[PDB]
Design an enzyme around this catalytic site. Sequence first.
Site, PDB file in Angstrom:
ATOM      1  N   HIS A 118     -18.234  33.161  60.515  1.00 18.80           N
ATOM      2  CA  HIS A 118     -18.897  31.889  61.329  1.00 18.80           C
ATOM      3  C   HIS A 118     -19.002  30.761  60.379  1.00 18.80           C
ATOM      4  O   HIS A 118     -18.700  30.787  59.128  1.00 18.80           O
ATOM      5  CB  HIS A 118     -20.584  32.211  61.451  1.00 18.80           C
ATOM      6  CG  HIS A 118     -20.795  33.590  61.866  1.00 18.80           C
ATOM      7  ND1 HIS A 118     -21.464  34.411  61.438  1.00 18.80           N
ATOM      8  CD2 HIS A 118     -20.187  34.144  63.240  1.00 18.80           C
ATOM      9  CE1 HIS A 118     -21.659  35.510  62.328  1.00 18.80           C
ATOM     10  NE2 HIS A 118     -20.845  35.288  63.358  1.00 18.80           N
ATOM     11  N   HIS A 140     -21.014  28.000  58.779  1.00 20.93           N
ATOM     12  CA  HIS A 140     -22.478  27.471  58.458  1.00 20.93           C
ATOM     13  C   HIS A 140     -22.703  26.190  58.406  1.00 20.93           C
ATOM     14  O   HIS A 140     -21.506  25.651  57.986  1.00 20.93           O
ATOM     15  CB  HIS A 140     -22.886  28.340  57.350  1.00 20.93           C
ATOM     16  CG  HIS A 140     -23.123  29.830  57.694  1.00 20.93           C
ATOM     17  ND1 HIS A 140     -24.278  30.377  57.818  1.00 20.93           N
ATOM     18  CD2 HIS A 140     -22.274  30.706  58.102  1.00 20.93           C
ATOM     19  CE1 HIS A 140     -24.283  31.721  58.145  1.00 20.93           C
ATOM     20  NE2 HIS A 140     -22.958  31.902  58.330  1.00 20.93           N
ATOM     21  N   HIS A 162     -25.905  28.945  60.770  1.00 16.90           N
ATOM     22  CA  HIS A 162     -24.803  28.486  61.534  1.00 16.90           C
ATOM     23  C   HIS A 162     -24.719  27.301  62.110  1.00 16.90           C
ATOM     24  O   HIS A 162     -25.689  26.700  62.295  1.00 16.90           O
ATOM     25  CB  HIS A 162     -24.609  29.591  63.045  1.00 16.90           C
ATOM     26  CG  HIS A 162     -24.623  31.070  62.732  1.00 16.90           C
ATOM     27  ND1 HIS A 162     -24.194  31.858  63.578  1.00 16.90           N
ATOM     28  CD2 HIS A 162     -25.015  31.681  61.618  1.00 16.90           C
ATOM     29  CE1 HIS A 162     -24.118  32.979  63.116  1.00 16.90           C
ATOM     30  NE2 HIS A 162     -24.646  33.023  61.960  1.00 16.90           N
ATOM     31  N   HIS A 216     -26.785  31.731  70.004  1.00 16.85           N
ATOM     32  CA  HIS A 216     -25.683  32.691  69.415  1.00 16.85           C
ATOM     33  C   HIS A 216     -24.910  33.343  70.251  1.00 16.85           C
ATOM     34  O   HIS A 216     -25.686  33.888  71.249  1.00 16.85           O
ATOM     35  CB  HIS A 216     -26.047  33.563  68.117  1.00 16.85           C
ATOM     36  CG  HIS A 216     -24.969  34.174  67.531  1.00 16.85           C
ATOM     37  ND1 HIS A 216     -24.123  33.677  66.953  1.00 16.85           N
ATOM     38  CD2 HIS A 216     -24.580  35.555  67.779  1.00 16.85           C
ATOM     39  CE1 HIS A 216     -23.091  34.604  66.730  1.00 16.85           C
ATOM     40  NE2 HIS A 216     -23.464  35.532  67.076  1.00 16.85           N
ATOM     41  N   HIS A 224     -22.660  28.689  69.489  1.00 12.91           N
ATOM     42  CA  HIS A 224     -22.754  27.533  68.384  1.00 12.91           C
ATOM     43  C   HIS A 224     -21.184  27.148  68.179  1.00 12.91           C
ATOM     44  O   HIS A 224     -20.569  27.992  68.411  1.00 12.91           O
ATOM     45  CB  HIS A 224     -23.368  28.184  66.954  1.00 12.91           C
ATOM     46  CG  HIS A 224     -24.642  28.972  67.262  1.00 12.91           C
ATOM     47  ND1 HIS A 224     -25.264  29.954  66.180  1.00 12.91           N
ATOM     48  CD2 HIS A 224     -25.910  28.970  67.783  1.00 12.91           C
ATOM     49  CE1 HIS A 224     -26.536  30.297  66.444  1.00 12.91           C
ATOM     50  NE2 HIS A 224     -26.729  29.618  67.556  1.00 12.91           N
ATOM     51  N   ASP A 270     -19.389  29.736  65.836  1.00  9.32           N
ATOM     52  CA  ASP A 270     -19.429  31.055  66.215  1.00  9.32           C
ATOM     53  C   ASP A 270     -18.126  31.584  66.693  1.00  9.32           C
ATOM     54  O   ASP A 270     -17.593  31.515  67.622  1.00  9.32           O
ATOM     55  CB  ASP A 270     -20.303  31.281  67.675  1.00  9.32           C
ATOM     56  CG  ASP A 270     -21.735  31.234  67.378  1.00  9.32           C
ATOM     57  OD1 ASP A 270     -22.198  31.603  66.067  1.00  9.32           O
ATOM     58  OD2 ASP A 270     -22.327  31.468  68.422  1.00  9.32           O
ATOM     59  N   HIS A 297     -19.270  38.085  56.949  1.00  8.71           N
ATOM     60  CA  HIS A 297     -20.421  39.108  56.809  1.00  8.71           C
ATOM     61  C   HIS A 297     -20.293  40.173  56.369  1.00  8.71           C
ATOM     62  O   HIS A 297     -19.090  40.918  56.708  1.00  8.71           O
ATOM     63  CB  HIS A 297     -21.259  38.581  58.055  1.00  8.71           C
ATOM     64  CG  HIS A 297     -21.861  37.421  58.261  1.00  8.71           C
ATOM     65  ND1 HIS A 297     -23.071  36.977  57.680  1.00  8.71           N
ATOM     66  CD2 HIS A 297     -21.423  36.113  58.717  1.00  8.71           C
ATOM     67  CE1 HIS A 297     -23.554  35.643  57.986  1.00  8.71           C
ATOM     68  NE2 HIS A 297     -22.239  35.182  58.428  1.00  8.71           N
ATOM     69  N   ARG A 342     -24.111  37.839  53.722  1.00  6.19           N
ATOM     70  CA  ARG A 342     -23.081  36.964  53.403  1.00  6.19           C
ATOM     71  C   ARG A 342     -22.252  37.459  52.275  1.00  6.19           C
ATOM     72  O   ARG A 342     -22.689  37.456  51.211  1.00  6.19           O
ATOM     73  CB  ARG A 342     -23.397  35.482  53.146  1.00  6.19           C
ATOM     74  CG  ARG A 342     -24.303  34.957  54.141  1.00  6.19           C
ATOM     75  CD  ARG A 342     -24.963  33.471  54.037  1.00  6.19           C
ATOM     76  NE  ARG A 342     -25.816  33.211  55.108  1.00  6.19           N
ATOM     77  CZ  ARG A 342     -26.479  32.162  55.408  1.00  6.19           C
ATOM     78  NH1 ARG A 342     -26.019  31.319  54.794  1.00  6.19           N
ATOM     79  NH2 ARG A 342     -27.453  32.027  56.624  1.00  6.19           N
TER      80      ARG A 342
HETATM   81 CU   CU1 Z   1     -22.002  33.460  59.479  1.00  5.45          CU
HETATM   82 ZN    ZN Z   2     -23.800  31.520  65.900  1.00  4.62          ZN
END
Ligand code: CU1
Ligand code: ZN
Lengths: 152, 152
Positions: free
Chosen positions: A45, A47, A62, A70, A79, A82, A119, A142
């Site tokens: 993702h 951020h 995010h 999400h 998002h 995403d 992640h 993370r």
């Molecule tokens: Cu993430």
């Molecule tokens: Zn997301």
Amino acid sequence: TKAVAVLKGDGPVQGIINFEQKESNGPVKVWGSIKGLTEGLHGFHVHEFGDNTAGCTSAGPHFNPLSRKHGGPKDEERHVGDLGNVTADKDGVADVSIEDSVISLSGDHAIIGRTLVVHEKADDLGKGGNEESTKTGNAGSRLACGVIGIAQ
Amino acid sequence: TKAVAVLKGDGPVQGIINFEQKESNGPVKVWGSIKGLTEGLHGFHVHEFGDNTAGCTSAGPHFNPLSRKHGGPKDEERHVGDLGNVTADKDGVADVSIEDSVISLSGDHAIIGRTLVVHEKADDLGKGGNEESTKTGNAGSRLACGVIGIAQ
Ligand SMILES: [Cu+]
Ligand SMILES: [Zn+2]
Ligand SMILES: [Cu+]
Ligand SMILES: [Zn+2]
């Protein structure tokens, strides 16, 4: 038109991810490699903040400028950040080669100066059936991150 | 508009530098601290690329979108990225506090997504009496760097 993120953490996960966008209203190609991962799916993702002052935690939530739930990259409801999951092989290496039309390298949804994160766990794509699923996809901690910078 | 760069390298040199710009046509405030340096002056520049694939060398040259000659921050003839020198005390700590009206955090020439570098030696500000002086200021190797990212 072109950017790069070098992913680093406190563990063994490292990688380099490239971004290229030929046209401002066109798709972003995202490609590279990540190593040091457990075999299987890992959330992937963008951020909100390009802030590494406290490790990957400083990157914040995010990137979600349109305040949506999400989802997976193929969903209308998602998002901006995403990008779903990357898949690591039995040797812990994830080769990434996707295309996305929601992220951009310019304009209001520009991801330049924001953070790419990989992640601990699989992103459930908002289909995990709990409150957290529609917030983060339950992808967990993370493992590595990097600020998305302008590249040649 | 706010940004941050976390400076890291292959040695003891580390720091956090904050950027804030209250107005899009106003000065950028740059502040923070760098430690692990030798006592004295160290070149302090924004480089063109936010690319850390091969360490600080990947950041490329001084950010110079207007194709000017290298100079000091007070000079009319300077690169956009020419922020001069930071001074480290006898304990090796450089407290950074400057304002600059050439760099910006927004617009076509924004430094967000580019790289902040601190150098081995003093920037001679183009007055070192050789070819390299008017190109890079003869500040030597790059000790630490970080991509300039969007901050909260
Ligand atoms: Cu993430
Ligand atoms: Zn997301
Ligand atoms: Cu420099
Ligand atoms: Zn310069």
